[PDB]
From a paper:
Lysine benzoylation (Kbz) is a recently discovered post-translational modification associated with active transcription. Here, we systematically characterize writer, eraser, and reader proteins of histone Kbz in S. cerevisiae using proteomic, biochemical, and structural approaches. The Spt-Ada-Gcn5 acetyltransferase (SAGA) complex and NAD+-dependent histone deacetylase Hst2 could function as the writer and eraser of histone Kbz, respectively. In addition, we demonstrate that a subset of YEATS domains and bromodomains serve as Kbz readers, and structural analyses reveal how YEATS and bromodomains recognize Kbz marks.
To elucidate the molecular mechanism of Hst2-mediated debenzoylation, we determined the crystal structure of Hst28-294 in the complex with the benzoylated H3 peptide (H35-14K9bz) at 2.0 Å resolution. In both structures, Hst28-294 exhibits an elongated structure containing a large Rossmann-fold domain and a small zinc-containing domain. The small domain consists of four α-helices (α3-5, α9) and three β-strands (β4-6). Both the H3 peptide and the cofactor product bind to the cleft between two domains. In the Hst2-peptide structure, histone H3 residues from T6 to K14 were modeled based on the electron density. The histone peptide adopts a bent conformation and makes extensive contacts with Hst2 through both electrostatic and hydrophobic interaction. The majority of H3 binds to a negatively charged surface of Hst2, explaining the preference of benzoylated lysine flanked by positively charged residues. Specifically, H3 R8 is positioned in an acidic patch containing Hst2 D68 and D70, reinforcing the notion that the strong histone binders of Hst2 (H3K9, H3K18, and H3K27) share the RK signature. Benzoylated lysine 9 (K9bz) is snugly inserted into a relatively hydrophobic tunnel and adopts the same geometric configuration of H4K16ac as seen in the Hst2-H4K16ac structure. The bulky benzene ring of K9bz induces a 20° rotation of the phenyl group of F67 to coordinate a π-π stacking interaction with the benzene ring. Additionally, K9bz induces shifts of I117 and I181 to generate a larger space to accommodate the benzene ring.
Residue numbers in the entry:
A (entry chain C): 6 to 14
B (entry chain A): 8 to 205, 214 to 293
Write the structure that this text describes.
């Protein structure tokens, strides 16, 4: 599922 | 500062059997001598700063790692457990555990200083991985950490570890930008979220994080509105800024100072000092 990032929603 | 710390103690003394979830980031280890890595200079990141990256997050970016593994190797040498002493705040987590009011600590840090302060493995969620093992960034094949730790001691660091199946680079199972988080993170948050939805009121305390890194930064807005949230941070950030709730408690304090003030508001100084002196 969830991948690490500085962005998002 | 004062009033919001009183209100935290007020909540804990009026809900004595309730447990607390902590969510923490790099701010709780700055006093230990681990800076927040985007700003280099004198100290831990000194020799990373010399041959320096095209962007601040390059050292924990899997694409940059692929292009040049030496900067991360150099950083990792400094970050293996055993280099640092946990902070007063880390030991506050151990004190909450001793008092049976620690539900979980979710940490974005890879310094494992929660563990090193004595928090039990069951109560720690290392959301961005750790040095406990290594993995191929291609295969995903798992390796013991010693394959990597041994290269870190060599002068100089060259011929980086590669996968014995597909030949891609192997590294500690720390979550770089661009990589998936460990399954235990989402699975445990799903369980603790249901527990937060179940009259001893729990409490969630967010400490020392800019809430700028996802998906970890999604956790505060997922706290139920009926559960009190605390932010202890130099500035109001994340969902506490974008979507303030009336019951939110803000503490603009350094994390060690917050630990000291809360411990003695709770009346736990003598137990805390015993922990600190060991
Ligand atoms: Zn592989």
């Amino acid at each position: 599922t969830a991948r690490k990032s500085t962005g998002g929603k | 500062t004062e009033m919001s710390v009183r209100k935290i103690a007020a909540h804990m003394k009026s809900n004595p059997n309730a447990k607390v979830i902590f969510m923490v980031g790099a701010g709780i280890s700055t006093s230990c001598g681990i800076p927040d890595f985007r700003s280099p200079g004198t100290g831990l990141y000194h020799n990373l700063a010399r041959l320096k990256l095209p962007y601040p997050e390059a050292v924990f970016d899997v694409d940059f790692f692929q292009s040049d593994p030496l900067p991360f190797y150099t950083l990792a040498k400094e970050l293996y457990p055993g280099n640092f002493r946990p902070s007063k705040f880390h030991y506050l987590l151990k004190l909450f555990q001793d008092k049976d009011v620690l539900k979980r600590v979710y940490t974005q840090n890879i310094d494992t200083l929660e563990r090193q302060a004595g928090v039990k493995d069951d109560l720690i969620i290392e959301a961005h991985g750790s040095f406990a093992h290594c993995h191929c960034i291609g295969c995903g094949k798992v390796y013991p950490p010693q394959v990597f730790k041994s290269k870190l001691a060599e002068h100089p660091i060259k011929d980086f570890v590669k996968c014995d199946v597909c030949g891609e680079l192997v590294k500690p199972a720390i979550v770089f930008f661009g990589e998936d988080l460990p399954d235990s993170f989402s699975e445990t948050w799903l369980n603790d979220s249901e527990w937060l939805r179940e009259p001893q009121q729990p409490l969630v305390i967010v400490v020392g994080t800019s809430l700028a890194v996802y998906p970890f930064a999604s956790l505060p807005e997922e706290i139920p509105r009926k559960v009190k949230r605390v932010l202890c941070n130099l500035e109001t950030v994340g969902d506490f800024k974008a979507n303030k709730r009336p019951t939110d408690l803000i503490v603009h304090q350094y994390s060690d100072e917050f630990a000291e003030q809360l411990v003695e508001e709770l009346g736990w100084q003598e137990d805390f000092e015993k922990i600190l002196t060991a």
